[PDB]
Structure 1
Amino acid sequence: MGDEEKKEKKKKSKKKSEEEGGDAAPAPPPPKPPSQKRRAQRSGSNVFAMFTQHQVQEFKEAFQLIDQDKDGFISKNDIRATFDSLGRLCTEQELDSMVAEAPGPINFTMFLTIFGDRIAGTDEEDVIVNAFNLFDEGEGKCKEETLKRSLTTWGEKFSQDEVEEALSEAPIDGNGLIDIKKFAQILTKGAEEEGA
């Protein structure tokens, strides 16, 4: 008595992180008088566009397609056949390193969780998109010359090659850039075939 909770929960851990990769450590709250454990909450969540809507989901639904032979557990071969369905393939050693970014069995448990934490790298849509928006003087179009003056000089200084490569693909409406559109050419819903 004062027991039938604490006994029963030892099942929980078996489908999830506690075998599969216990970096994310839990803490069991209750001492024998149970009304005390109410100081154990997970307080606080949302930062900004954390799981970027156009990116995150349309992947998990596609688990049935990565999972080839239908067991939940992706081998390097379940990958190997499916990249052969997309278009362009990467080699084994390339995919083997990727697999080794995870601790072992890339299954529904492992796959989702590794996806879960990785949010850092790219910048959010509004942030990139606001960069020449905040720069125009009263709303017209920003001169490709000042873009070409700043990149090469006023900050980190990119190379002759790096710059004019990234320059070329530019909707240059008459000496100015169509800023939001080239910002879309930097980031939007588009490019495939790169993982996973």
Structure 2
Amino acid sequence: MGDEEKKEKKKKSKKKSEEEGGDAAPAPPPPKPPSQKRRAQRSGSNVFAMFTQHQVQEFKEAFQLIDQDKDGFISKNDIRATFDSLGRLCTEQELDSMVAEAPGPINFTMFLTIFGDRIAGTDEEDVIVNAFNLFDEGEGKCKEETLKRSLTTWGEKFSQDEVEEALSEAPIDGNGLIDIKKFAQILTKGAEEEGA
């Protein structure tokens, strides 16, 4: 794929989950066979109970963007629109992530199968080492600080805000967030700062 081409097949590839509006187009071309879709989306299926916690409060933090109305059952794309831009922090492209963590309108009743559909979602479970790992020439787990690196040197270019924010918001385990946790992010390890 020439210079021009790999601009086009960000917007044209776009193999789910990559069919999202982007920062200046979504993901850089996967090669011509569609094997790599599986690393574009992973999905599991364990449902977790609502009102069992007391960090359950979180659903009220998200609420406003996903429930304009006071008993919800608002419009069905508005999860897929607004929540993108400051809900689970800034910058839109949360389209297919949102359409795969909500199976129609979200509200307090519906919450069991979104909390559950977090664990289906995109790049959830189905944990595999090799995906990010093969970058650094297969040497050690491929974590946060090398991703930031790569974004300013190689690869297709995307909005720098999101990355500097993401490093700062790190929990820190000490070798950062490995590929394991980049998938397995639903079970432990999340973000800080503004939003949802």
With normalisation by structure 1, the TM-score equals 0.28
**Aligned mates of 1:181, 1:149 — CA distance in 2:** 19
SS in 2 for 1:10: helix
Task: Work out the number of aligned pairs and report it.
Answer: 196
Cα distance change of structure 1 residues 77 and 51 upon mapping to structure 2, 3 Å threshold: same
Structure 2 residue 141 is matched with structure 1 residue 158:
no
1:186–1:149 CA distance, 2 compared to 1 (3 A):
farther
Give the conservation status (yes or no) of the 8 Å contact 1:132–1:179: yes
Alpha-carbon distance in structure 2 between the residues aligned to 1:175 and 1:37: 27
| CA 1:50–1:13: 2 relative to 1, 3 Å | farther
**Structure 1 residue 132, shift from structure 2 partner:** 2.4
Q: Is the 8 A contact 1:129 1:183 kept in 2?
A: no
Structure 1 pair 52–28 and aligned structure 2 pair: CA distance change class (3 A): farther
Which whole-Å CA distance do the structure 2 matches of 1:40 and 1:62 have between them? 25
Q: Which moved more, 1:94-103 or 1:6-15?
A: 6-15
Identity over aligned pairs, percent:
100
Which structure exhibits the higher relative contact order, with contacts defined as CA atoms closer than 8 Å and separated by 6 or more residues?
A: 2
CA distance in 2, matches of 1:31, 1:90: 29
Counterpart Cα distance in 1 of 2:20 and 2:86: 29
For 2:141 and 2:37, the matched residues in 1 are separated by 60
Distance 1:2 1:119, change over 3 A: closer
Quote the Cα distance in structure 2 between the aligned partners of 1:135 and 1:37: 18
Structure 1 residue 42, shift from structure 2 partner: 26
- Secondary structure of the residue aligned to 1:64 is helix
1:72-120 Cα deviation digits (max 9, x unpaired):
9999999999999999999999999999999999999999999999999
Task: Please report the RMSD computed on the Cα atoms of aligned residues, expressed in angstroms.
Answer: 17.7
Per the normalisation by structure 2, the TM-score is 0.28
Measured at CA, do residues 13 and 88 of structure 1 come closer, stay the same or move farther in structure 2, by a change above 3 Å? closer
Residue aligning to 1:35: 35
How many angstroms does 1:164 deviate by? Answer: 0.8
The 8 Å contact of residues 181 and 189 in structure 2, kept in 1 or not, is answered as no
Specify whether residues 129 and 71 from structure 1 end up closer, same or farther in structure 2 by C-alpha distance, changes over 3 A only.
same
Unaligned segments of structure 1, at least 5 residues: none
Q: 1:36 to 1:52 in 2, by over 3 A?
A: same
The superposition leaves residues 116-155 of structure 1 with CA deviations (integer Å, 9 ceiling, x where unpaired) of 9999972464477642233354553446543222123423
1:9-46 superposed Cα distances (whole Å, 9 cap, x missing partner): 99999999999999999999999999999999999999
Pick the structure with greater CA Rg.
Answer: 1
Unaligned runs of 5+ in 2: none
Change in 2 beyond 3 A, CA 1:9/1:48: farther
Tell whether the 8 Å contact from 2:102 to 2:113 is kept in structure 1 after alignment.
no
| 1:141 and 1:177 in contact (8 A); partners too | no
* 1:161-176 pair list within 5 angstroms: 161-170=161-170, 172=172
